[PDB]
């Protein structure tokens, strides 16, 4: 495995270069803020929507996508994957300078052939293993999350150095940036989002629903299954030292005995078989067809699903718990500004 | 629901009083450190083992359990639940002063009748919804985790004020301290440890095993299922704003569409039915019998299970990942000392 940390990547390839962050959403905002705070010349390219004014409000040089690309040495395409094809064809390909680098943060558009190599220009993937807020929060703490990278086309011979320079400036090399094919990254990423994340929340919800049906205080039930932050803490501490190890070190003997009675015995074959089906639907292109269909609207069915989700007993109970119990939040005040808001006492 | 935050609980009931922390383990150490830093007079009562010298090393007045109880107004029994009966009968009951308060952090010993009310003395439960390290780390950040409390016996009329004074000093009232019966707390707590925690780790492991069997990079597979910290971050951010809400706010449209394709559809009836069985085994006293049997040895079978757990593919892969990727850790240097170690650069 090829893994780069801070000492394996220089900022020198970005000196006197301009990085165009295309999009100012979940990833675009975090990339833009970290690049700027790392002393990189950054511009934002964005369509005429709320994100354009947000980028301006947070002190960035903002223009349409075409002008940003045309005045950039490195272009980071940080907009939704189903929009890549149209923006690549219309905005990026006609304006990408000779010897410039285009990066995606997900391999989907590469697998589908919506983003393709261009003569005289570099193409790469730099895919964070983390969402926007934590990438920004970690960065401010001198930390970072891992990333996968893939050099798809290196026409200049500088593609790797520039990608790893972006990675260090955004903070991914503080954890590690591992070489992984865009195809494998695509399937990995989609599998986490389609099998693991839903199954994980479904499980928490099953815990809540059984407790409430059996007459347990709904606030207490919600708190134990995730609301307290304890299961989230176990998973984040587990990420560091191992999940079984967290229980061995911080579980009472009563907890450890209970845990190890059921550890490896809880799930039937049907869960493992569902994981295989999700993966086949991802690899076979069934999901890709489903996604394109959902993106045919402005994600109308997704909007309905999000709304319906919040009416579920678990999310009704959550609102009641979070109203009654204060949570240890890190204030988001000017998190993506050059200077953050005064600390909230 | 009766929930106390900082403004509903005074430190005044602890002024000129001594708190004996019995045990200096996962909970005992966090209680002792927070109480001291909150300006409470704290002593440690502990048997002649490694925890005794650790308490002394961290600057505490440490004696045997009998002497600590005898010189205390409030006694916190923070040792394993199966040891409560013998320590109550031998060390606590004969030495508990007139008008003194005994607190447990779990209702198990109360349900089993191993800890019982005593004439002229107060009995209560103050059960944190969090393990030791995070209680201490939250406290240092001016934060806290929730707790459940139950006044089992109030012979003085001061039991509630003293319990909630302990809760505020240790930091639980920064989130909220909710009245909940020791019995219900017992079953809730055991259910989280026996159904949810194992099922959660089993699920993560199922994700890892299917990916590795299907030819995915084992480091990448491990990172996606928890190793990156992303799923842990989703769960901890989810604790605050809701699990579905985290995906709605920080998920890409591709992620959100994938998530909502499978959300509420991933688990068969068998999982829900297993949750019911675990709960019946807890409520019926089957687990209690199993626990007493495991505690008959010095938890010998648990030691074997912990050792075996670390040899599993997931934990072998974890060691390889954590060697190759740096994780954003909060340094544990003198975390439980009056003054913490110099910040690790
Ligand atoms: N560990 C947690 O995260 C947690 C959370 C909530 C509730 N609790 C409750 O808190 C209590 C303490 O659990 P813990 O996890 O801190 O335990 P632990 O395993 O860390 O306990 C070790 C401590 O107990 C003492 N001890 C062990 N066996 C003893 C014995 N036979 N006689 C006397 N002292 C003995 C040791 O000297 C040491 O001080 C239990 O009632 C538990 O259910 C623990
Ligand atoms: N969100 C994450 O946590 C995350 C993590 C890793 C990878 N990624 C990848 O990063 C990329 C960005 O995802 P995101 O989550 O930041 O997205 P997002 O949903 O926040 O994207 C919103 C942004 O995209 C722009 N945009 C939306 N539709 C557009 C269109 N039709 N034409 C032009 N611009 C348009 C908006 O103007 C705004 O700037 C995707 O390739 C995604 O797969 C995201
Ligand atoms: Mg991802
Ligand atoms: Mg417990
Ligand atoms: Mg507990
Ligand atoms: Mg994704």
Author numbering:
A (entry chain A), B (entry chain A): 3 to 347
What does the paper say about this structure?
A trait of BP bacteria is a conserved gene cluster coding for the biosynthesis of polyketides (malleicyprols) with a reactive cyclopropanol unit that is critical for virulence. We show that BurG, an unusual NAD+-dependent member of the ketol-acid reductoisomerase family, constructs the strained cyclopropanol ring. Biochemical assays and a suite of eight crystal structures of native and mutated BurG with bound analogues and inhibitors provide snapshots of each step of the complex reaction mechanism, involving a concealed oxidoreduction and a C–S bond cleavage.
To investigate the redox proficiency of BurG and its ability to regenerate NAD+ from NADH we devised an absorbance-based assay with the substrate surrogate hydroxypyruvate 8. BurG was incubated with 8 and NADH and the light absorption of the dinucleotide at 340 nm was monitored spectrophotometrically. A clearly observed signal decrease corresponds to the formation of NAD+ and glyceric acid 9, the reduced form of 8. The transformation of rac-12 into the trapped enolate 13 provides evidence for an intermediary oxidation during the catalytic cycle of BurG. We obtained similar results in co-crystallization assays with BurG, NAD+ and the substrate surrogate hydroxypyruvate 8. Subsequent hydride transfer from the C-α of gonydiol to NAD+ (yielding NADH), and deprotonation at the β carbon by E232 would result in an enolate intermediate (14), as mimicked by hydroxypyruvate and the oxidized carba-gonydiol analogue 13.
